[PDB]
Amino acid sequence: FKAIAGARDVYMNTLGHPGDLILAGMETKEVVNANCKACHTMTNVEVASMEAKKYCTDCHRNVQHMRMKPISTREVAD
């Protein structure tokens, strides 16, 4: 995974042209989500929290890199 992910990230940073929006693929949404469960099983054991929302971050939205905060708290010109 690390090798394949590293390969395409190196390609996009050198010979590719990334857009204005950088977003995660299905592959990485599914590995991130499985890791939420790996470290937080015990909070969630008695509850059907995997059933309504597809991903844990559909409720824990700011775990996705504080995306709801104003741009200036996150971003500057290159």
Binding site: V47, A48, D58
Partner: protein
């Protein structure tokens, strides 16, 4: 090496010791004491928020202190529901544990006769005992008198509870509602195979909805129906009620009415708690955020393990707004509160102003109906049109007033609906003045509160008093009721 993730996350599966037809709440308490403890929190009936809360005050009363009245009340409710059971009693909604207790204390149901004068459909959203009763009487259940089942139920063990939403054996979520199942079928939806995010609103959409009862020629007499065929917005429901109904009045043929207002003589629609239809296309609803997300939020109260809160109440009762703060973890609780109030303050003010123009619309139509001067050549067709606008005006403000969030579920739909309500009501006034060549103008000059005072007191008992029935000029459109002793006090017959 190895993982010490020895405990794996699995969706919980249940197999209880209960029978397939268990409906007693107490029967679930041994199996599920954590969720049952949560459910008992609904007994709290002392706490107010800014606009809502769990004290059952009288909704028209801004004169008396709590628990009789409140600072945010709608003074004109009895006036606007003249000749309808809501002119007798109408209180702020409180916890699910009180549903039958409150049902059995309410003056909307006649307690001064054996018969209540309301259908057994009134039990529809109060008790899982609805399953036995319909199994037993079928289609004939609905048109029975409400008071027939008044002494055949346990106020506490049979209120809204576990079997309302849960299969007792598996604990999987269930729709037990007749009218909601009817609606789902009509959309080609399988009520037993609904996705989970949809279930987490539909369970509430069994009851927190606008509904009407069939008339004798509409299908099964008195069966409950959700008027959702045209869509969910007020204009859609309005349109639905133009097409389905049984009225024979000139200008209103085939339309639905819940009653006709005895002052204005307008065929009226009553709206009731349309939370589902309001929620579904508001900013949270349309974004897949659900009743259970805010009102049944996960609470880490079992050591630190989540359970689902079964305390269905105002999310504002938690000063730390914990329901909101995973999605809005970047915002403080007080920021979130100020944003709810930004909506609620404006919704509520606009509502009182919409209800005042509605009272004036009724009063203008009343004056034009009883006018002795020279009328316009198109008087009859103008009075039909004025009544159509009183009717539509009232339905629009009522769709908002009846909804329990004071605009928060759908800020834009609520504010817009009230803005439109004003327009329709004012147009009723305009047509009523045109019909009489402005002859009623002199009678419509003041502050409306002076020419039609708010009716603070009205109950079934007081309507028996012939001298009280002289204390307001709108009381002359109502009959003085026969002297009658209370028959029922809760579940007891009186001797």
């Amino acid at each position: 090496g190895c993982s010490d993730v020895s405990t794996e996350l699995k969706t919980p599966v249940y197999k209880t010791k209960l029978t397939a037809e268990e409906i007693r709440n107490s029967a679930f308490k041994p199996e599920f004491p954590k969720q049952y403890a949560s459910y008992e929190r609904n007994d709290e009936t002392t706490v107010m928020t800014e606009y809502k809360g769990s004290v059952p005050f009288n909704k028209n009363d801004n004169v008396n202190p709590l628990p009789e009245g409140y600072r945010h009340a709608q003074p004109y409710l009895k006036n606007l529901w003249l000749g309808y059971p809501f002119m007798y009693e109408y209180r702020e909604a409180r916890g699910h544990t009180y549903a039958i207790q409150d049902f059995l204390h309410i003056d909307r149901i006649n307690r001064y006769a054996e018969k209540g004068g309301l259908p057994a459909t009134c039990w529809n959203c109060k008790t899982p005992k609805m399953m036995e009763w319909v199994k037993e009487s079928g289609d004939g259940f609905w048109a029975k008198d409400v008071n027939e089942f008044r002494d055949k139920i346990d106020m506490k063990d049979h209120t809204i509870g576990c079997a309302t939403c849960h299969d007792p054996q598996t604990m999987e979520l269930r729709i037990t509602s007749v009218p909601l199942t009817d609606y789902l079928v009509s959309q080609g939806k399988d009520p037993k195979k609904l996705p989970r995010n949809e279930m987490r609103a539909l369970v509430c959409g069994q009851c927190h909805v606008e509904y009407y009862f069939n008339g004798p020629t509409m299908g099964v007499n008195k069966k409950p129906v959700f008027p959702w065929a045209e869509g969910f917005d007020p204009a859609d429901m309005y349109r639905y009620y133009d097409k389905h109904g049984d009225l024979q009045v000139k200008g209103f043929e085939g339309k639905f009415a819940d009653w006709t207002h005895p002052a204005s003589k307008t065929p009226m629609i009553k709206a009731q708690h349309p939370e589902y239809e309001t929620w579904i296309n508001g900013t949270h609803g349309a974004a897949g955020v659900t009743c259970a997300d805010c009102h049944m939020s996960y609470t880490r109260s079992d050591d630190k393990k989540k359970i689902s809160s079964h305390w269905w109440t105002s999310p504002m009762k938690d000063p730390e707004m914990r329901a909101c703060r995973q999605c809005h973890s970047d915002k403080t609780p007080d920021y979130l509160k100020s944003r709810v109030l930004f909506t609620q303050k404006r919704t509520f003010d606009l509502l009182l102003a919409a209800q005042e123009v509605s009272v004036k619309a009724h009063e203008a139509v009343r004056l034009a109906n009883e006018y002795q001067g020279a009328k316009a050549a198109g008087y009859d067709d103008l009075m039909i049109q004025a009544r159509e606008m009183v009717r539509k005006g009232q339905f629009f403000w009522d769709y908002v007033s009846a909804e329990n969030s004071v605009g928060f579920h759908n800020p834009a739909k609520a504010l817009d609906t009230l803005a439109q309500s004003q327009q329709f009501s004012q147009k009723a006034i305009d047509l009523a003045m045109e019909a009489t060549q402005y002859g009623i103008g002199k009678d419509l000059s003041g502050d409306i509160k002076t020419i039609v005072p708010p009716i603070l007191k009205m109950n079934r008992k007081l309507q028996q008093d012939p001298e009280f029935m002289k204390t307001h000029k709108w009381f002359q459109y109502l009959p003085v009721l026969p002297k009658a002793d209370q028959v029922w006090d809760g579940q007891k017959r009186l001797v």
